[PDB]
Amino acid sequence: DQVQDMYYLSPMQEGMLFHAILNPGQSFYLEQITMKVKGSLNIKCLEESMNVIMDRYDVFRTVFIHEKVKRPVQVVLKKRQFQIEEIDLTHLTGSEQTAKINEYKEQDKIRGFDLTRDIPMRAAIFKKAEESFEWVWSYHHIILDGWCFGIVVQDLFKVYNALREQKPYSLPPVKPYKDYIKWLEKQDKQASLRYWREYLEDFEGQTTFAEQRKKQKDGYEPKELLFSLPEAETKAFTELAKSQHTTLSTALQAVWSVLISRYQQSGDLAFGTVVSGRPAEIKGVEHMVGLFINVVPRRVKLSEGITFNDLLKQLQEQSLQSEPHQYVPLYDIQSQADQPKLIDHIIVFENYPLENGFDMVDVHVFEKSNYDLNLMASPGDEMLIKLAYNENVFDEAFILRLKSQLLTAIQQLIQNPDQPVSTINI
């Protein structure tokens, strides 16, 4: 037998597997990393390093079985070989190389992953010229989220940049994903469901930006508006977050709360937020690799006279009480309120968003969007904010207005953190 271990699926993994089988070929839970490499690259060592990553991270040797079993199980294999699929585009013009790679990217989203047999990650390198390559990296979220993929990337390049130069290396020990499954099986699932039920008690629901939503036929027109926060306000926004003993993510959620409070004309609002899902009870959970992040509902209550520091407190405290219950899938939370549309937009703060070797220019991450509006923020000397929206629902003019309103609200809130947020002008 080629089986190394066998354990159950996390609640998120089970719903992910359930929807993946029911909707094949719809790019569900698929992430496609596309990048152009301008430089020299040892293909054989990249293949060798990938197989080190293969045997270092058990999530890549994992398959899922749902048939003829009372409850789905994940099977990790003792050994599996990864082929990096090299494609020669030297004998082709530029346009044929572009279409050949674009044909791969479109077909790759449709093929997806047979989670019962395939490796939940596939790679393709297109040699378009000498020292000119294009990488199409794909993986399934059932085994890997965005943050943990960066850990795999650094481990791959550490092994790559060493093997080629013959110099040896050592890699930090990894904690098996089974330890997270073990922690889950020890939690009271009903106690976590009750937390979200109480947390969302008497919430009526809301269609965010209702009068700005265009009422057309369903369908997604992906568009983006990217902008930065100047270093001065970024340093002050971080200092205010450090002063109030809260995170930079919570600080942005509070600014967004004030903005939507004006559009909805209400003090009871909800939006999606991505939580780490990494329980601090497990030691070394920071170095584990697997599926941890989750979108959970965030309910913000804005009473009369509430200040930004008061809002910063309400949010940071709820972030702590929710930590033992961040494993609950959003479907289970929404069913415990008969509100299939409890949230319709999310805020994401990626602290490490997606030298030795070559040059990596033009990175693009493809991910199917489940919401008509997504506020994405990344750290840095000047905070980078992205507004990814569906053009069939929202116009660019409104997204541009939200940019100006978000920038002026950030400034007004860092300078008057103890003034009632109702006094903020947007």
Side-chain angles (χ1 to χ4, degrees), residues 1 3-35 37-43 45-57 59-69 71-78 80-157 159-165 167-184 186-214 216-238 240-241 243-282 284-340 342-358 360-426:
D1 251 346
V3 183
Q4 146 175 341
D5 207 339
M6 215 202 246
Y7 38 102
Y8 281 135
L9 265 75
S10 83
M12 282 172 255
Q13 277 182 312
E14 263 180 272
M16 275 197 59
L17 184 66
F18 175 79
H19 277 283
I21 307 157
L22 282 192
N23 301 282
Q26 305 303 305
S27 317
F28 274 125
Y29 311 115
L30 209 184
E31 184 151 330
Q32 209 184 54
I33 305 292
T34 35
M35 72 160 27
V37 159
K38 296 317 288 223
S40 147
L41 153 75
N42 167 327
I43 321 313
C45 270
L46 214 51
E47 275 157 71
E48 224 269 319
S49 25
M50 275 294 341
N51 282 286
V52 194
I53 295 320
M54 272 319 277
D55 296 20
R56 162 165 182 86
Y57 293 114
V59 300
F60 299 122
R61 311 175 264 120
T62 299
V63 283
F64 301 82
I65 296 157
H66 60 277
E67 283 164 17
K68 309 230 262 273
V69 184
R71 174 186 181 180
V73 288
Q74 38 192 327
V75 166
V76 46
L77 297 195
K78 323 151 154 283
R80 193 105 92 101
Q81 177 75 213
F82 180 94
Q83 258 264 296
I84 220 162
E85 198 200 81
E86 32 262 74
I87 296 130
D88 207 351
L89 267 51
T90 56
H91 297 152
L92 289 173
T93 80
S95 147
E96 321 151 337
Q97 290 170 346
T98 286
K100 220 95 191 213
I101 293 165
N102 277 330
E103 185 175 20
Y104 179 94
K105 283 157 34 157
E106 281 330 280
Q107 149 270 341
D108 194 57
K109 298 154 179 196
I110 288 158
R111 176 186 328 251
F113 292 95
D114 190 355
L115 297 175
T116 70
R117 269 145 209 290
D118 307 356
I119 297 207
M121 173 183 59
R122 81 165 56 90
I125 301 100
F126 292 85
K127 185 185 190 359
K128 58 209 307 222
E130 215 75 40
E131 287 214 0
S132 192
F133 299 78
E134 190 121 36
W135 297 4
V136 198
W137 230 269
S138 296
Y139 70 99
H140 200 289
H141 286 122
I142 198 145
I143 58 110
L144 217 40
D145 56 45
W147 142 263
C148 297
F149 183 55
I151 296 144
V152 172
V153 157
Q154 300 213 342
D155 283 30
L156 168 77
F157 287 144
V159 181
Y160 164 65
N161 283 161
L163 279 165
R164 56 188 219 159
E165 317 196 346
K167 302 137 172 133
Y169 64 78
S170 188
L171 273 199
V174 85
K175 205 158 208 262
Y177 191 63
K178 210 208 191 141
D179 297 359
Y180 177 59
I181 306 293
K182 252 78 190 283
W183 174 89
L184 280 170
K186 275 143 208 53
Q187 316 297 307
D188 188 348
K189 271 48 190 313
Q190 273 275 329
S192 297
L193 282 186
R194 179 209 65 221
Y195 166 75
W196 293 112
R197 179 185 326 130
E198 301 167 329
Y199 179 60
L200 306 173
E201 263 200 9
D202 308 299
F203 188 69
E204 314 223 341
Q206 42 137 339
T207 298
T208 312
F209 308 131
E211 317 174 357
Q212 286 83 25
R213 280 184 61 95
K214 299 179 277 184
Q216 327 183 324
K217 201 171 70 133
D218 272 291
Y220 210 103
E221 190 46 74
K223 294 244 169 225
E224 283 172 8
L225 171 75
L226 303 91
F227 58 95
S228 269
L229 191 74
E231 287 177 35
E233 283 106 23
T234 304
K235 192 39 217 163
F237 200 61
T238 313
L240 183 46
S243 317
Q244 300 308 298
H245 295 149
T246 192
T247 87
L248 242 191
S249 182
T250 286
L252 184 67
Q253 294 181 39
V255 179
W256 189 253
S257 307
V258 185
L259 185 138
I260 65 173
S261 86
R262 314 291 196 81
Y263 277 92
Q264 314 297 112
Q265 303 161 262
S266 147
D268 202 24
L269 316 149
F271 50 79
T273 172
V274 171
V275 287
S276 79
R278 285 158 129 73
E281 337 187 352
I282 305 117
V285 76
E286 50 217 345
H287 305 118
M288 305 204 32
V289 149
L291 172 57
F292 295 89
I293 68 142
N294 194 26
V295 174
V296 300
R298 172 84 93 166
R299 195 168 167 215
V300 194
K301 272 150 132 201
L302 281 81
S303 70
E304 37 162 283
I306 191 134
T307 72
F308 190 75
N309 285 343
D310 269 346
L311 212 58
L312 276 191
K313 184 181 164 253
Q314 160 192 144
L315 289 196
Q316 182 73 8
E317 274 44 80
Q318 191 269 338
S319 269
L320 241 182
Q321 330 163 238
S322 75
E323 250 160 61
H325 325 288
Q326 306 185 329
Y327 67 92
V328 182
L330 181 72
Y331 170 84
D332 302 336
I333 297 167
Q334 258 159 21
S335 299
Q336 287 240 339
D338 206 79
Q339 265 254 290
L342 205 141
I343 69 175
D344 56 350
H345 65 298
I346 58 162
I347 290 132
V348 185
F349 200 102
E350 320 199 317
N351 281 91
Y352 303 99
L354 352 82
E355 267 59 12
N356 202 329
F358 34 75
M360 277 178 241
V361 48
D362 270 34
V363 86
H364 185 234
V365 185
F366 168 75
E367 256 179 280
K368 192 178 90 91
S369 326
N370 332 295
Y371 298 98
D372 300 317
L373 179 51
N374 315 265
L375 185 82
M376 311 201 99
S378 303
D381 297 290
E382 34 167 17
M383 190 185 273
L384 208 184
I385 306 165
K386 179 204 286 148
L387 270 167
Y389 65 104
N390 178 14
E391 204 264 297
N392 299 325
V393 169
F394 295 119
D395 287 308
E396 177 159 26
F398 176 54
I399 309 295
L400 266 175
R401 180 72 85 144
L402 286 177
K403 168 184 150 158
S404 11
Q405 289 175 332
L406 199 64
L407 292 160
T408 186
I410 279 154
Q411 174 255 123
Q412 287 176 69
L413 285 162
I414 70 201
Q415 312 199 303
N416 289 115
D418 275 315
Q419 216 60 34
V421 307
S422 47
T423 72
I424 301 303
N425 156 48
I426 51 149

